[PDB]
Amino acid sequence: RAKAKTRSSRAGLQFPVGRVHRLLRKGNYAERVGAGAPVYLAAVLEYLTAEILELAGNAARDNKKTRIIPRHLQLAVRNDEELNKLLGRVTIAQGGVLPNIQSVLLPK
Template sequence: MSGRGKKQAVAGTSGSTSKRSRSARAGLQFPVGRVFRLLRKGKYADRIGSGAAIYLAAVLEYLTAEILELAGNAARENKKTRILPRHIQLAVRNDDELNKVLAGVTIPQGGQGEESRHSAIPVNFHLVQIHGASEVV
């Protein structure tokens, strides 16, 4: 039978044993198997413990959930139902800890951060009124 229905119990095994992914066993949404494969493929070390992939997948899932939560709030504040790269940029740059972790990261289509917008104006830029006309000093 080639369908996706219930599997028939094989003699000698109980019907309740089913294959569960490492992600499901760890209670994660992020793929532990893929993280483990990428850790091995990246040659970061000769040997990779199985707990390392679970831990890294959990950290990645937590950081992603945190950024999505803050970006969703930023989108809601702008009366949007879709999270845009600009909302992710605002979320990361307005959170002190995330800003520190992602300090060297450029978010494409994220727009300028608050710091760079203020630093674009020179410090010695002053307007002086001279006989009704503006003049730059």
């Protein structure tokens, strides 16, 4: 037997291709599932993950703090139009409201 190479290494990905395949097979999505399907889905889940954490990291540095916390994630999603369209029906715990007053209410 030759030495093993995990399918994520073959596709050049950090998320797990093997686990995604099990989850699909046992999740009642279809009678069968192809071998390119877990590779495509693992690549999309890692891209969307990197898209959030990039803007979260920048919100953490803007607050001058080294660790991402749950508020930083809210400030990222809400301040981007497409992530706010993707996550428009979601509540995030320990997430504040973006700062905002209607200009009618401000003093003269």
